[PDB]
Design a protein around this ligand. Structure first.
Ligand SMILES: Nc1ncnc2c1ncn2[C@@H]1O[C@H](COP(=O)(O)O)[C@@H](OP(=O)(O)O)[C@H]1O
Ligand SMILES: C[C@]12CC[C@H](O)CC1=CC[C@@H]1[C@@H]2CC[C@]2(C)C(=O)CC[C@@H]12
Ligand code: NA
Length: 291
């Protein structure tokens, strides 16, 4: 009823915090400021950081299963957004009572500053920016906090100019990779999980210091699969208020594959995009999505 009243009042617009665009209604100068400056960062805290639409949900479910050592009970009975609350959202983990698992879309220059001097763990996940553009385009049409994308072509110019929620994808990931090297930082991609979920899971277990038996492992893998996840009412967001997410028009877990961009980018849009990528990612290393 509280979340319901809020959802129906969403303008579908943006406001800015230190130069970055944030959706109006689900974020505030204060909700963000709090996450940025809070001192409450713990040694065993766990953060999942991503640029929107990179497969956050997938990562969140994977760790919820790892923490419960494969027992689906927790993900079947508790809402996904409650198991790994968002830091910057008006109703965030920092504006709630009590291993803490948290989620965030904040770019490194705004993320909880007290982190850099802590032992908390951060898993950063990246996805092919092209597939992110698609996922985000569709999701915008059904997400109450987001403005309509407009034409695929205009939405792409907005994306390339960082004129979208959370700013530039380029800046976002370039900034966060600056942590690559600290032992309490893990960088993994949506593409790696797609190519070998089990391998990725074991990897993430090593990183977290939480080994699993061929048993629990198999369970985490089974329940993390797209098909399984889209069927879990607590994980597929079908419980959210229609205004916040138009279930009548689409699903949060849309397709769940790599390369859908190829059915959405025209060759002209693809070429323009590559020039923008080529210029912004000049010094960067090679990623799975770099063919
Ligand atoms: N278990 C899973 N397997 C594959 N894709 C998954 C997934 N869980 C979530 N996703 C995909 O991740 C995207 C949502 O990202 P986020 O959680 O960061 O908002 C969606 O992409 P698509 O729109 O391409 O289908 C969604 O289907
Ligand atoms: C939009 C967002 C925040 C951004 C995520 O990538 C997707 C998401 C899922 C559920 C939303 C949450 C914002 C905070 C909300 C509104 C809650 O308090 C419950 C449902 C939550
Ligand atoms: Na919308």
């Amino acid at each position: 009823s509280d979340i319901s009243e809020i959802s129906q009042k969403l303008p579908g617009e943006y406001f800015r915090y230190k130069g970055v665009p944030f959706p109006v209604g689900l974020y505030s100068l204060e909700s963000i400021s709090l996450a940025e400056n809070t001192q409450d960062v713990r040694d065993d805290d766990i953060f999942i950081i991503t640029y929107p639409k990179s497969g956050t949900t997938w990562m969140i479910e994977i760790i919820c299963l790892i923490l419960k050592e494969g027992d689906p009970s927790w993900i079947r009975s508790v809402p996904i957004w409650e198991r790994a609350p968002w830091c910057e959202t008006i109703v965030g983990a920092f504006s709630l009572p009590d291993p803490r698992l948290m989620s965030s879309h904040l770019p490194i220059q705004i993320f909880t500053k007290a982190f850099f001097s802590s032992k908390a763990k951060v898993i950063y996940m990246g996805r092919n920016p092209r597939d992110v553009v698609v996922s985000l385009y569709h999701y915008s049409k059904i997400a109450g906090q987001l403005k309509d994308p407009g034409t695929p072509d205009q939405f792409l110019r907005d994306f390339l100019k960082g004129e979208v929620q959370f700013g530039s994808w380029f800046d976002h990931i370039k900034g966060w990779l600056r942590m690559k090297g600290k032992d309490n930082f893990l960088f993994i991609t949506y593409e790696e999980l797609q190519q070998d979920l089990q391998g990725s899971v074991e990897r993430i277990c090593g990183f977290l210091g939480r080994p699993l038996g061929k048993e629990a492992l198999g369970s985490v893998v089974a329940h993390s699969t797209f098909s399984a996840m889209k069927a879990n009412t607590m994980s597929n967001y079908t419980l959210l208020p229609p205004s916040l997410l138009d279930h009548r028009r689409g699903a949060f877990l849309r397709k769940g594959v790599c390369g859908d961009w190829k059915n959405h980018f025209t060759v002209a849009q693809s070429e323009a995009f590559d020039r923008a990528y080529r210029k912004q990612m000049r010094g960067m290393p090679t990623f799975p999505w770099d063919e």
